[PDB]
Amino acid sequence: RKPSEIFKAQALLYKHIYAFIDSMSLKWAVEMNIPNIIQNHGKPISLSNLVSILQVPSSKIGNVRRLMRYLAHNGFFEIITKEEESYALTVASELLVRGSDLCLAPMVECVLDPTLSGSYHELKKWIYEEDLTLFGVTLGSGFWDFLDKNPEYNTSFNDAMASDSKLINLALRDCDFVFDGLESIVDVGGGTGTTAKIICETFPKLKCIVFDRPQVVENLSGSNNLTYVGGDMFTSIPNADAVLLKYILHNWTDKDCLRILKKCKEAVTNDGKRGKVTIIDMVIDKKKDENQVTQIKLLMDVNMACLNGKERNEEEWKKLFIEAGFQHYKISPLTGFLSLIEIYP
Amino acid sequence: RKPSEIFKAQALLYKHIYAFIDSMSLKWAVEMNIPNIIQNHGKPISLSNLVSILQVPSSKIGNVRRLMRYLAHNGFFEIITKEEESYALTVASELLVRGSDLCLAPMVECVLDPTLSGSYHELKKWIYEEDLTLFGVTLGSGFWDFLDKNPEYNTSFNDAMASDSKLINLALRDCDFVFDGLESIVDVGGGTGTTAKIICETFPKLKCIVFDRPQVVENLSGSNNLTYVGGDMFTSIPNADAVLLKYILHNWTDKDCLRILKKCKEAVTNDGKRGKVTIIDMVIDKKKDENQVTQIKLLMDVNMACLNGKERNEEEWKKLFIEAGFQHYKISPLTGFLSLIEIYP
Ligand SMILES: Nc1ncnc2c1ncn2[C@@H]1O[C@@H](CSCC[C@H](N)C(=O)O)[C@@H](O)[C@H]1O
Ligand SMILES: Nc1ncnc2c1ncn2[C@@H]1O[C@@H](CSCC[C@H](N)C(=O)O)[C@@H](O)[C@H]1O
Ligand SMILES: COc1ccc2c(=O)c(-c3ccc(O)cc3)coc2c1
Ligand SMILES: COc1ccc2c(=O)c(-c3ccc(O)cc3)coc2c1
């Protein structure tokens, strides 16, 4: 109990109690297709033209205006006022326009699914579980098994992973030091082969194996140098000169990462060979990164409770590599929030 | 498509996609009883003592640390580092300590109920409804009927309304200009009589009627000058020299507010008398309020979609008063986010 610093603390508490409205209002704008409507309009759109296109009832027009102004203050639209109030895209809402260079709208829709995002109401039950991941607590099965049983969820997750894929995959194939001298590579947890296809288009003579769970690669067909193998990375990974792990390790505890890293080391050290493992994931660095960037990485780290995952700093990465028996490593920036890490057995 | 301003826009988009984590992590701290554990400890608590008291499994201790650091950066705890990392309360988390002067933890728990807060996933369906409120869309009945059928929800809502009641009610009873000369007052939507009891303790000769829905006031007993009346404010409000509306009008559309205001005007103009109506609710004022304050009011306005409610600025309030047939009004600051508005028939 202090003076009027209580009103200030109350404002902070309210901001956080209602923070979910920032997520739900953004979801609403994407579901209403507002970014694309504005892009197609070719100029800032008036409130009257917007609600005309949306065909909302007149009793809810004021509610559309209130939501638009809330999203604009957050940076997703720019309000221009003349005879009428109009709404223009911003660089942030341009990221939600279809066919734009980098479109992350599928990420908004995937993450904000009611069941998945609603799982965070159970952080208390989860913190008391010795082994279950947050999704394991709420979905009743592990996440990958869950995707296998729920096609619409699998589609949504794949579209979300695809959404920043071009950017990362092009940054990766532009890294000659990763591919120099390789004759073969296996993309572990390679999905439907998105990364591998870009790799093969770039390096036509390189053999690339897309390795993932049987249900993921079933019925997929490869072609000239690109093949698919269904398996379990905790049991056996195909031999190759190198292993790629893109967005894999941050989905697992340190104990599980050690299991995966041991199987990768085995895969690149068969028949006397001494290959390497290439990892794409975030590297937290509080002293080097710009604060804004560090804050998003820390936020992603908390979000990884979904799979008992983690976003790691350099000392955490180093400790795993050493414990898995790798002799040295190198970290390079790759693109945006991600780094390229190479580890040598 | 621009230069590296894309990475900056991506950081903004991610902040908003995952904003619900700010709400869920705050809910987690209250459910784990962390603010009270720290208060009872009497000093900043070490991570090891905290997880000892919580009895979380060792596999989740790191997750407790990650959540604590995320909440601390948000302002809910202060990290103190010595031989160990320790966590101290802040003015904002002191608002979550039981028996503290002003405790808003019940507000966090009420609002963040999964069903209620989860309703905001349906903003699109709601914006297309001519009449339904957001809660009407998701709960299948109006909110008040819903509380009548769900005791635990009614308890949670009452505890939440009670949480800032002492502060507002004491500010109200200290306003002599409101009570001077009154012989009777009816608190419309008066709940279980929380405000009326403070009014009667202050003004022992004043007659006060607590008026609310029959299920709310059933079995409640009054005493000397305080009585309870069950009814419907849209149909008939008991005559009195004045009507009090605390946190009522912001829960209704302009059309419904006009209906309530007409019934209040009738109640204070019977038998040739010319009484008044006293309203306690927010008044948005972008040019007078500090920006931080305006932002919370605008945020509460968006949140009122739950009941098709609204937080109004002075011109919006004035337009309702005039349309309801009141001749003039006066607005005064009351406490924190609230104003005291008096309207004269
Ligand atoms: N035991 C296991 N063995 C092999 N792959 C696995 C696995 N458990 C999970 N995976 C998978 O790892 C994934 C990784 S998420 C998508 C990853 C892909 N590298 C990309 O960047 O898009 C899923 O494709 C998933 O099926
Ligand atoms: N038709 C109606 N007639 C009378 N009261 C009503 C009503 N519809 C809703 N109410 C009520 O208005 C409320 C107001 S919320 C709590 C209000 C109370 N003045 C306080 O400040 O705590 C509920 O108590 C609710 O039952
Ligand atoms: C493989 O790389 C990733 C990266 C991010 C996520 C992610 O963010 C979620 C997630 C989190 C919260 C939700 O509400 C919904 C989905 C699930 O898997 C993931 C896998
Ligand atoms: C009478 O005054 C009020 C003031 C605020 C609220 C409120 O904030 C909610 C609410 C909003 C979102 C949720 O998730 C849960 C509850 C319901 O009724 C209310 C009534």
Give the DSSP letter string of A11-35.
HHHHHHHTTHHHHHHHHHHHHTTHH
Ligand 4, pocket-test mutation among B111, B123, B159, B300, most atoms within 8 A of CB: B111
Rounded to whole angstroms, how far apart are CA atoms B61 and A44?
50
Could you tell me if A143 and A166 are in contact, meaning their C-beta atoms sit under 8 angstroms apart? no
What experimental approach yielded this model? X-ray
- Per residue, the 3-state secondary structure of B127-180, as one string, reads HCCCCCCHHHHHHCCCHHHHHHHCHHHHHHHHHHHHHCHHHHHHHHHCCHHHHC
Q: Count of residues for chain B?
A: 345
Residue A124 CA, distance from chain mean position: 24
Residue A298 structure tokens: 């820390």
B170 contact partners, CB below 8 Å, separation of at least 6: B198
Residue A234 CA, distance from chain mean position: 22
Rounded distance from Cα B244 to ligand 4 centre (Å): 20
B48 contact partners, CB below 8 Å, separation of at least 6: B84
Q: Give the type of residue at B225.
A: N
- Per residue, the 3-state secondary structure of A196-261, as one string, reads HHHHHHHCCCCEEEEEECHHHHCCCCCECCEEEEECCCCCCCCCCCEEEEECCHHHCCHHHHHHHH
- Per residue, the 3-state secondary structure of chain B, as one string, reads CCCCHHHHHHHHHHHHHCCHHHHHHHHHHHHCCHHHHHHHHCCCEEHHHHHHHHCCCHHHHHHHHHHHHHHHHCCCEEEEECCCEEEEECHHHHCCCCCCCCCCHHHHHHHCCHHHHHHHHHHHHHHCCCCCCHHHHHHCCCHHHHHHHCHHHHHHHHHHHHHCHHHHHHHHHCCHHHHCCCCEEEEECCCCCHHHHHHHHHCCCCEEEEEECHHHHCCCCCECCEEEEECCCCCCCCCCCEEEEECCHHHCCHHHHHHHHHHHHHHHCHHHCCCEEEEEECEECCCCCCHHHHHHHHHHHHHHHHHCCCCEEHHHHHHHHHHCCCCEEEEEEEECCEEEEEEEC
Residue B55 structure tokens: 């009895």
Rounded to whole angstroms, how far apart are CA atoms B155 and B144?
13
Residue B87 structure tokens: 């966590």
Residues facing residue B109 across a β-bridge: none
Residue A100: its H or E element:
none
Residue A7: its H or E element:
helix A5-17
Burial degree of A99 (CB within 10 A; 0-12, 13-18, 19+) = exposed
For residue A131, give the nearest of A307, A6, A279 by alpha carbon: A307
Q: Does A100 touch chain B (CB under 8 A)?
A: yes
Rounded to whole angstroms, how far apart are CA atoms B292 and B278?
27
Rounded to whole angstroms, how far apart are CA atoms B340 and B244?
10
Q: Give the type of residue at A9.
A: A
Could you tell me if B334 and B340 are in contact, meaning their C-beta atoms sit under 8 angstroms apart? yes
Could you tell me if B226 and B196 are in contact, meaning their C-beta atoms sit under 8 angstroms apart? yes
B200 contact partners, CB below 8 Å, separation of at least 6: B206, B208, B224, B225, B226
Residues facing residue B343 across a β-bridge: B277, B329
Is residue B190 within 6 Å of ligand 2 at its C-beta? yes
Residue A342: its H or E element:
strand A338-344
Torsion angle of the four alpha carbons B200, B201, B205, B207, in this order, in degrees rounded to the nearest 10: 10
Rounded distance from Cα A14 to ligand 3 centre (Å): 27
Residue A284: its H or E element:
strand A283-284
Residue A8 CA, distance from chain mean position: 35
Name the strands in the sheet holding B207-212, side by side, starting at the edge strand that comes first in the sequence. Answer: B226-230, B207-212, B184-188, B242-246, B276-281, B338-344, B328-335
B259 contact partners, CB below 8 Å, separation of at least 6: B234
Could you tell me if B162 and B198 are in contact, meaning their C-beta atoms sit under 8 angstroms apart? no
A 10 A CB-CB count for B330 gives 11
Rounded to whole angstroms, how far apart are CA atoms A259 and A149?
26
Resolution in A: 1.4
Rounded distance from Cα B230 to ligand 3 centre (Å): 50
Rounded to whole angstroms, how far apart are CA atoms A141 and B53?
30
B228 contact partners, CB below 8 Å, separation of at least 6: B193, B209, B210, B211, B212, B217, B220, B221, B222
Q: Where in chain B is the domain with CATH 1.10.10.10?
A: 1-96
- DSSP letter string over A162-189? HHTHHHHHHHHHT-HHHHTT-SEEEEET
Residue A328 structure tokens: 């040295």
Q: Where in chain A is the domain with CATH 3.40.50.150?
A: 97-345
Cβ-defined contact of A94 to B300 (cutoff 8 Å): no
Assigned fold of B1-96: Arc Repressor Mutant, subunit A (1.10.10)
Could you tell me if B185 and B246 are in contact, meaning their C-beta atoms sit under 8 angstroms apart? no
Please report how the helices B61-73 and B47-54 are oriented relative to each other, as an axis angle in degrees rounded to 10: 120
Q: Are strands A242-246 and A276-281 parallel, antiparallel or unpaired?
A: parallel
First-to-last C-alpha distance (Å) of chain B: 59
Q: How far is CA A160 from CA A108, A144, B134, in A?
A: 8, 15, 28
Name the strands in the sheet holding A45-46, side by side, starting at the edge strand that comes first in the sequence. Answer: A45-46, A85-89, A77-81
Residue A21 structure tokens: 């409205």
Phi, psi of A142 (to 5 degrees): -70, 160
Could you tell me if B95 and B164 are in contact, meaning their C-beta atoms sit under 8 angstroms apart? no
Q: Does B124 touch chain A (CB under 8 A)?
A: yes
Residues facing residue B210 across a β-bridge: B187, B228
Q: A34-37: which pairs have CB atoms within 8 A and are 24 or more residues apart? A: A34/A93, A35/A89, A35/A93, A35/A94, A35/A96, A35/A97, A35/A105, A36/A96, A36/A97, A36/A98
| Residue in B14, B60, B114 nearest the CB of A296 | B14
Longest dimension (CA), chain A: 76
Residue A93: its H or E element:
helix A91-94
Phi, psi of B266 (to 5 degrees): -60, -50
Chain A residues touching residue B31 (CB < 8 angstroms): 123-124
Could you tell me if B110 and B156 are in contact, meaning their C-beta atoms sit under 8 angstroms apart? yes
Residue A190 structure tokens: 């390679």
The helix/strand/coil state of A288 is coil
Chain A residues touching residue B293 (CB < 8 angstroms): 11
Rounded to whole angstroms, how far apart are CA atoms B39 and B44?
9
B217 contact partners, CB below 8 Å, separation of at least 6: B192, B193, B210, B211, B228, B229, B230
Is A121 in the active site? no
Q: Sign of dihedral through CA atoms A137, A139, A141, A142?
A: negative
Could you tell me if A242 and A278 are in contact, meaning their C-beta atoms sit under 8 angstroms apart? yes
Could you tell me if B166 and B160 are in contact, meaning their C-beta atoms sit under 8 angstroms apart? no
Rounded distance from Cα B300 to ligand 4 centre (Å): 9
Could you tell me if B19 and A20 are in contact, meaning their C-beta atoms sit under 8 angstroms apart? yes
Q: Count of residues for chain A?
A: 345
| Residue in B20, B24, B101 nearest the CB of A1 | B101
Rounded to whole angstroms, how far apart are CA atoms B88 and B46?
9
- Domain B97-345, CATH 1.10.1200.10 — does that match? no
Could you tell me if B263 and B297 are in contact, meaning their C-beta atoms sit under 8 angstroms apart? no
Q: How far is B66 from chain A (nearest CA, A)?
A: 7
How big is chain A by its Cα radius of gyration, in Å? 23
Rounded to whole angstroms, how far apart are CA atoms B233 and B144?
13
Q: Give the type of residue at A226.
A: L
Which of A12, A53, A69, A256 to mutate to probe the B interface, most B CBs <10 Å? A12
Question: A33-45: buried (b, 16+ CB within 10 Å) or exposed (e) per residue?
Answer: bbbbbbbebeebb
Cβ-defined contact of B10 to A56 (cutoff 8 Å): no
Cβ-defined contact of B18 to A299 (cutoff 8 Å): yes
Cβ-defined contact of A292 to B11 (cutoff 8 Å): yes
Q: How far is CA B234 from CA A46, A94, B264, in A?
A: 37, 47, 9
- The response to whether B233 counts as a known ligand-binding position is yes
Question: A102-137: buried (b, 16+ CB within 10 Å) or exposed (e) per residue?
Answer: bbbbbbbbbbbbeebbbbbbbbbebbebeebbbbbb
